[PDB]
Amino acid sequence: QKLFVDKIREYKSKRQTSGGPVDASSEYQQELERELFKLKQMFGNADMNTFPTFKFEDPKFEVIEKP
Amino acid sequence: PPLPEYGGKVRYGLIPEEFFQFLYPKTGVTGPYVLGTGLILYALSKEIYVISAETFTALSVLGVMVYGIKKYGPFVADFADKLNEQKLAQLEEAKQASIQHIQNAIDTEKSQQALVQKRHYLFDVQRNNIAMALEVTYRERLYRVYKEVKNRLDYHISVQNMMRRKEQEHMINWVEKHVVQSTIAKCIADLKLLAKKA
Amino acid sequence: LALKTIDWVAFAEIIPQNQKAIASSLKSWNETLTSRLAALPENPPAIDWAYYKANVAKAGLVDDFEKKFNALKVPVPEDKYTAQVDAEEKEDVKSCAEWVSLSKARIVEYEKEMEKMKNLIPFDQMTIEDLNEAFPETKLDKKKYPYWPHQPIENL
């Protein structure tokens, strides 16, 4: 099995990525920021990593009694 | 005090029937007429009633009077009776009209009391609206808090997921890029099996 | 939420003509709030941390996000408005009951008058003064017309 022997080595070269977040990219972040731009802004407009603090309003009310 | 119905039963408009009844027991039915004849003849025969021009003046007036009562008496009687019937009917209708007016006032008052008894719906409606607004706001608040926490957690999971996806893509294209960076044993074994194809 | 079922035409009969607009606006808000309590359910569907334990690769952040949620004190709005419309209803019932007592006085008075008119003397046995105390409209104005016939000649 030449090509199966072949492959195993290449996944190992890949697994050699301790200090490599993206396996020797030297690129592909310039668009990943754009991708992440879309993703974060379309989930929300805040520090999603942190917990949301909740402000709550109360209903209005009027003069209802017989004028 | 109610009036009687009939008068006194006069005869010839000049002599009441009490007289004929009063002279019946002693002189029959012809006693009064014999007495009248006798008195008339005695007044004439003895010049107590002097026949003169006043005899014929009186005859003409009495003839006009008898003819008048006989001809225009029914009309005057019915006219008086109809006058009374019209006044009576008008008064009766005014009575019924006042009865109806006061009955209508009583009915109207009972209807107003029914209305004023129905009043409480305005205030229980106001209570309904207050309660409903408070409950809607409570559930909206719980949905807001739920949806925010879930949105943050699923944003985390989605960024991790698509990061894994793009990273695996760069991975795979590296492993292809790496066979370009790199023995006919399999070549011959391939032809060997191709020969066994026959 | 335990609501008071209401007739709406009955609500219509008891509304003075100086506040139909307010009644209809009150009415319109009832319908909107009925609808909106209908569609959104009662309590949010809570979520298992499992799908957020095995796919949140961050250091214990899912657990505090979920801890901050199991420990959250969401503010329950209080009424501050039902007691005063109850007070207004109590005050109104006072006004309503007193007006009824007046009308009950008038009703017994009207029945007195209808018993009076129902027991009149027959009309063919009746002085003119007896008529003038039955229907007092038929009394001669001897103030304005002091001389006979004590009424305008055209009336005769």
DSSP secondary structure string for all residues of chain C: -------SHHHHHT--TTSHHHHHHHHHHHHHHHHHHHHS-SS-----SHHHHSS--SSSHHHHHHHHHHT--PPPPP-SSHHHHHHHHHHHHHHHHHHHHHHHHHHHHHHHHHHHHHTPPPTTS--HHHHHHHSGGGS--TTT--STTSS-TTT-
CB within 8 Å: A58 and C77: yes
Distance of residue A29 Cα from the nearest chain B Cα, in angstroms: 10
Among candidates C22, C75, C84 on the partner chain, residue whose Cβ is nearest the Cβ of A56 = C75
Task: Give the integer Cα–Cα distance in Å for C156 and C153.
Answer: 5
Query: In whole angstroms, how far apart are CA B113 and each of B137, C14, C60?
Result: 39, 11, 70
Q: Are C114 and B99 in contact (CB under 8 A)?
A: yes
- Resolution given for this structure, in angstroms: 3.5
Q: Which residues of C92-108 are buried (b: 16+ CB within 10 A; e: fewer)?
A: beeebeeeeeebeeebe
**Identity (one letter) of the amino acid at C127?**
T
Q: Is A8 left (phi over 0), alpha (psi -120 to 50) or beta?
A: alpha
Task: Give the integer Cα–Cα distance in Å for A39 and A45.
Answer: 11
Q: Are C37 and B135 in contact (CB under 8 A)?
A: yes
**Token pair 């008195």 is at which residue?**
B39
Task: Give the integer Cα–Cα distance in Å for B114 and B32.
Answer: 80
Task: Give the integer Cα–Cα distance in Å for A35 and B168.
Answer: 16
Which positions in chain B touch A47 (Cβ < 8 Å)?
none
Which positions in chain A touch C68 (Cβ < 8 Å)?
51
How would you write B43-101 as a 3-class SS string? HHHCCCCCCCHHHHHHHHHHHHHHHHHHHHHHHHHHHHHHHHHHHHHHHHHHHHHHHHH
Q: Are C78 and B73 in contact (CB under 8 A)?
A: no
Among candidates B133, B145, B170 on the partner chain, residue whose Cβ is nearest the Cβ of A59 = B133
Bridge-partner residues for B10, per DSSP?
B16
Phi, psi of B175 (to 5 degrees): -65, -30
Length of chain B: 198
Which positions in chain C touch B123 (Cβ < 8 Å)?
85-86, 88-89, 92
**Identity (one letter) of the amino acid at B159?**
V
Determination technique for this PDB entry? cryo-EM
**Token pair 């949806």 is at which residue?**
B147
Which positions in chain C touch A66 (Cβ < 8 Å)?
16, 19, 88, 92
**Token pair 């990525």 is at which residue?**
A17
Q: DSSP code of B119? A: G
Q: Are B122 and A67 in contact (CB under 8 A)?
A: no
Instruction: For A6-49, give the DSSP string.
Output: HHHHHHHHHH--TT-SSSS-SSSHHHHHHHHHHHHHHH-SS-TT
CB within 8 Å: A67 and C18: yes
Which positions in chain C touch B131 (Cβ < 8 Å)?
1, 3, 79, 82
Distance of residue C15 Cα from the nearest chain A Cα, in angstroms: 10
Length of chain C: 156
Burial of B134 (0-12, 13-18, 19+ CB in 10 A): buried
User: Pick from B107, B186, B5: which is nearest to C124 by CA?
Assistant: B5
Bridge-partner residues for B11, per DSSP?
B15
For chain C, how big is the Rg over CA atoms in Å?
37
Q: Are A65 and B130 in contact (CB under 8 A)?
A: no
Chains that touch C (3 or more CB pairs under 8 A): A, B
What's the first-to-final CA gap in chain C, in angstroms? 75
Task: Give the integer Cα–Cα distance in Å for C111 and C117.
Answer: 10
